């Protein structure tokens with residue numbers, strides 16, 4: 001029995017996400033066709049011209065694909081499943097220069113090096129400065145009385161996290177943030193004029209300039225650690241560092257921002273959870289917010305060989321799209337998945353991907369950013385109330401909130 005979906009429904013259609021999350025449609029697949037071929041008409045494949053893809057809606061399938069990276073490749077078609085329909089193939093393949101879109105062994109080398117900058121020590125050293133900034137952000141927003149939660153609360157701290165990790169001087173953080181905000185959102189009319197390719201070129205240039213500067217004058221931030229050769233001569237070239245910085249902007253900015261915005265949307269919809277958060281401040285909240293927000297709706301892989309997955313035959317060369325937004329509400333894994341429960345524990349969500357070679361290296365940095373900012377929101381604007389509905393981002397793989405008017409005070 002075919003799933004009850006509209007003829008031609010495409011789960012990567014940006015026009016859906018500009019309006020809503022296709023929650024009921026995902027649940028229909030989980031029940032009636034947990035692995036479902038998503039057909040795509042000619043020229044409507046968001047940059048991919050292969051007829052469609054396998055929709056992966058169950059968490060254990062998402063995990064199986066993510067563990068078997070030897071079969072399911074990130075390099076072959078990249079992991080973003082939707083661009084503008086007219087994007088040139090070469091602009092897809094230039095994205096192979098970031099570690100996210102690499103397969104082993106190239107990925108293994110880069111991840112090993114880049115792991116130097118995401119040790120628990122490197123991340124935890126940012127705690128106090130980020131905590132201060134979180135408090136300052138929330139204080140300034142509340143003093144404005146009312147405004148755009150996305151811009152006055154959610155946007156800044158993720159960017160300051162990246163700047164702090166990289167040791168970006170304060171004078172430069174303005175243009176770093178600008179470049180990072182021009183990397184995604186390309187398909188929304190409000191951002192139709194951003195040029196992601198131009199922005200990345202400038203970022204790489206700035207990043208390479210910082211790499212050579214930091215070689216001359218080592219410090220104790222991670223840039224020095226990344227570009228200094230270890231015993232085996234391993235280190236990031238200047239351009240490899242540039243592509244690393246580009247990836248941090250792509251992977252660590254709007255995702256965390258959107259977790260914060262939608263975390264607060266969840267709290268506004270579930271005031272008992274909000275009261276419980278304000279009293280207890282449970283850090284488990286961070287994972288339930290990420291599960292609820294699932295900022296990355298989906299990443300894809302490409303089969304390098306035939307592979308049978310939960311009784312479905314994936315063919316060599318076919319794309320499989322991991323719908324984290326569906327898997328994070330999988331009734332077979334989660335107790336009451338549609339209950340927002342900041343105490344959920346354990347919380348095996350795949351908001352940071354499925355466990356495997358590409359698992360989000362910034363997951364704990366993100367969790368700390370979320371906990372710090374929501375502590376500050378609780379400290380400075382505990383009676384925050386929305387004014388109007390959120391505006392969603394037109395994107396086929398990012399679950400974004402562009403704007404959200406809130407009254408930071410009671411009235």
Ligand code: HEM
Nearest residue numbers: 099100251252255256259352353354358359360361362366
């Ligand atoms: C809520 C916030 C975030 C979410 C939802 C998120 C989500 C993800 C996902 C789904 C992946 C792919 C995992 C896979 O394919 O198995 C990923 C990878 C990655 N993330 Fe995150 N991320 C977040 C925050 C961050 C931050 C703050 C950073 C760094 C500052 C970061 C850096 C990375 C990097 C470098 C990768 C590539 C790892 C690799 O390819 O080996 N992310 N992230």
